Amino acid sequence: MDSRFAQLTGVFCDDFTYSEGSRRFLSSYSTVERRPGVPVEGDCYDCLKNKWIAFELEGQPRKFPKATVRCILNNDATYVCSEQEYQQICKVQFKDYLEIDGVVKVGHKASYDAELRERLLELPHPKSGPKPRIEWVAPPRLADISKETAELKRQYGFFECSKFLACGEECGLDQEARELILNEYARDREFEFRNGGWIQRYTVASHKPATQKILPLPASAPLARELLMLIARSTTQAGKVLHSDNTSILAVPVMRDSGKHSKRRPTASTHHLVVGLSKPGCEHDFEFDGYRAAVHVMHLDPKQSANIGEQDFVSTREIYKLDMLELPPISRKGDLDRASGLETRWDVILLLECLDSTRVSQAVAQHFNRHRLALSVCKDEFRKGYQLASEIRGTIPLSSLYYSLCAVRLRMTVHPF
């Protein structure tokens, strides 16, 4: 019981009658309406329902028996209570906003404010930093992009073949030949066979990054949609060769070898080795029963495979082609070649963007958008935005970055802005 709610209860019931004439709710703060000779379990009593009603604020319960009906006066101009009638009657009656002293406010000062402020004062504080010097210059020209591309080329070089990009081109093998070649390649590598599926067992890790170079661009990527769909399917269900209309791939779970109790079934964190076939003529050739094909492997974690396989090649290509300029022919190294170049290699580049889970091409595209929209940029700092080699790691991401830079160079050379 408190005296702060006297006014609140008075306006709650003004002329509300329950049976014919008698006020339904009697305020306990007024002796005229209060019932003498009986205990008071609340600030209001409903004769019709024969129950007590107690008003309290948000988060400030009062000491009343559980049987008493509690009404909550929310701070956002709304009310909550047990009975529907009380909730509705309170809402209409309290349509006028009246402040009841005893409501905590955001600016409330607690008794420990001084102690906490002193503790904050005794804690470390930052030191003012140096004022930067900013010089605005014109955005980089074709020479800077060429320099970046040449730096990448010199630092990393090129592979002798497009390892997994070559899987975008149909090999000269049929379904049965492809399955036999993949199975025999798995057998040759000493992969464990269990429950009709292949598993790659590892014991020790060199714990050093794999060699990184730049993949040359195949002539075209006709089997891009099929390759992505097959990657998705295989990484969803692994161990057996999965076939498409014109190609097939094998997803092998990679598991630790622990002896007898070694893992038998893959979990959600198990990586996969995706093995694909391409035309012969590289160091990764493999022969069996007169069937020759280049076998190329990509090691993907489950998230990487899910990202790669869910991309839409056809829709992306069409959306890009909606408002695209003429694409110049390019060579194996991404250099402009109007004599022996091919315009289909651009599709390959797109496939590369789909195969790269780091999607550095998106960073390059954003920086190139800034470049195109910019009139002046910071000196010796906007250029550094094109040097993303330290951000990524691996053959596929490196090739994607290199060919994104090559695309920027080609755009600046063929369609200068």
């Binding site: 948000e58 905590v104 409330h108 695209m324 780091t358 998106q362 929209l373 910019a374 991401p397």
Partner: protein
């Protein structure tokens, strides 16, 4: 291909980067950057501007919205097993429930009122005191933010204690209110394109436009700046407590706790930092770490740079630039007259996730593009047809479907390739209503939602209390017997009506079918 676009293009047609890399490296790098900024050798973290312009809201009632306090997203809960601190990764709902159980409070509002009205830090609130709450609220867990376009190396996000979330909710609500009062651009009901149009309207007078982004935004917003802003807007002891918790915060990397006295841990107080900038001047239109300003002469540019330095908004020399005929804000690019810049822009592709979710999201994206004028309607029709063909090629197999009904989509064993215009006009079979962007949820969405509800972090044996009477407030206190009675009555009514489960209600369909 993005490089050979006539208009503007961010290369958003593909999904963002992802990987299973552990978050140790990113969190360690962020903490090291924060420490370096603290030493005052790399960037500026000391606020110098005057915030007296900001109005004071110290007399406003302390209001908490429980909707954002309970959520299925992750959070860190701190317990003391024997004598050491153990940080467990739970859901925000579970963390809030545990906090209320230990403190023995019905609702978060009661907890905050009790915390603000204790005689001493050592006073007990249930099984814990304010001192214990502040000690536990300074612990954070680290995770990786993947699928962020343009960031090949994923950034580190942080999961906080339920008490930290409880205080941050109030602080950010009041900061957002003050921001809305400061300018008309920060209105709650405003889209990115509306904000960009207002920005264009604001900088038409001047000649040059500086489109700027802030570098190390989270590592340069010290607890001192947050406390300064909170005191300027009148947050009382809540702001002091939050600043104290932020100053002593510890991050659990792998299996070791690292102290990070600097920074604010990856966008916990976006509105507060926006206020830290907006209260010192009116020449900027900033949203956290992204802003646009305008100027006429190099002197104005120097003044802008000084203002940015004073407000601890360190300019990003790598990304910020100057234009005369362009305006980039909130990722949206507009011409100086306010019209949308021609080109793809921020159009994002729809990955293959569910036979029908893909179609619904593609319909939403194409509707957005067509309405904005990004592409003509026939192009959207062709793209929708192509997407339907691709979905058929990807999902039309026994694994996902075993039906052959004609009205079904070609990707579910059917033979119907709906026209985009036909779908948008509701001129199709009812089965296609779920594919409409404004239509019901698809089968895949419901299946995935149920499966998620069955996950380890979210699984519970509690008797579900769903399908409630609209007239019952969600703040009403209930017990086990009460929920049992409600469920029994509802099930009895449903069985009387002959329905085993409630019938799904769609606002659009109901409003359309009405006379």
């Amino acid at each position: 291909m993005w490089a050979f676009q006539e208009g503007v293009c961010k290369g958003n047609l593909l999904s963002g980067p992802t990987s299973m890399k552990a978050p140790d490296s990113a969190a360690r790098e962020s903490i090291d950057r924060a420490s370096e900024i603290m030493t005052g050798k790399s960037y500026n973290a000391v606020h110098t501007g005057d915030l007296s312009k900001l109005p004071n809201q110290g007399e406003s009632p302390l209001r908490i919205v429980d909707s954002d306090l309970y959520s299925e997203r992750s959070c860190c809960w701190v317990i003391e097993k024997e004598g050491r601190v153990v940080c467990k990764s739970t859901t925000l709902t579970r963390g809030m429930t545990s906090l209320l159980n230990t403190t023995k409070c019905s609702s978060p509002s009661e907890l905050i009122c009790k915390v603000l009205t204790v005689e001493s830090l050592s006073e007990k609130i249930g099984d814990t005191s304010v001192e214990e709450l502040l000690s536990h609220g300074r612990y954070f867990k680290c995770a990786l933010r993947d699928q962020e376009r343009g960031k090949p190396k994923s950034r580190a996000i942080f999961l906080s204690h339920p008490f930290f979330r409880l205080l941050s909710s109030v602080v950010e609500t009041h900061a957002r209110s003050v921001l809305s009062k400061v300018s008309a651009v920060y209105t709650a009901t405003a889209s990115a394109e509306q904000r960009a149009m207002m920005a264009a309207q604001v900088v038409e007078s001047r000649k040059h436009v500086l489109n700027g982004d802030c570098t190390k935004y989270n590592e340069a917003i010290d607890a001192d700046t947050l406390l300064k802003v909170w005191d300027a807007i009148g947050m009382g002891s809540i702001g002091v407590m939050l600043a104290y918790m932020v100053r002593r915060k510890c991050v659990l990397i792998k299996d070791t706790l690292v102290e990070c006295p600097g920074g604010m841990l990856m966008g916990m107080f976006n509105a507060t930092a926006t206020l830290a900038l907006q209260g010192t001047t009116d020449r900027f239109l900033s949203f956290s770490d992204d802003f646009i300003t305008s100027f006429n002469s190099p002197a104005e540019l120097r003044e802008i740079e000084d203002l940015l330095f004073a407000s601890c908004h360190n300019l990003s020399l790598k990304k910020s630039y100057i234009s005369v005929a362009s305006l980039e804000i909130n990722s949206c690019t507009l011409t100086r007259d306010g019209d949308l810049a021609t080109g793809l822009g921020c159009t994002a592709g729809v990955p293959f996730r569910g036979p029908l979710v893909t179609l619904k999201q593609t319909a939403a994206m194409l509707s957005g593009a067509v309405d904005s004028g990004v592409m003509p309607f026939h192009s959207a029709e062709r793209l929708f047809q192509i997407k339907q063909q691709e979905c058929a090629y990807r999902y039309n197999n026994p694994t996902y479907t075993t039906r052959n009904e004609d009205f079904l989509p070609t990707c579910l064993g059917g033979k119907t390739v709906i026209s985009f215009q036909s779908l948008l006009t509701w001129d199709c079979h009812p089965f296609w209503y779920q594919v409409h962007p404004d239509g019901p949820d698809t089968i895949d969405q419901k299946v995935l939602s149920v499966l998620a509800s069955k996950t380890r972090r979210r699984r519970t044996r509690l008797e579900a209390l769903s399908d409630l009477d609209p007239l019952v407030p969600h703040r009403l206190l209930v017990s086990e017997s009460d929920v049992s009675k409600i469920r029994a009555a509802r099930q009895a009514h449903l069985k009387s009506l002959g329905l085993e489960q409630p019938t799904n209600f769609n606002y659009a369909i109901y409003k359309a079918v009405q006379p």
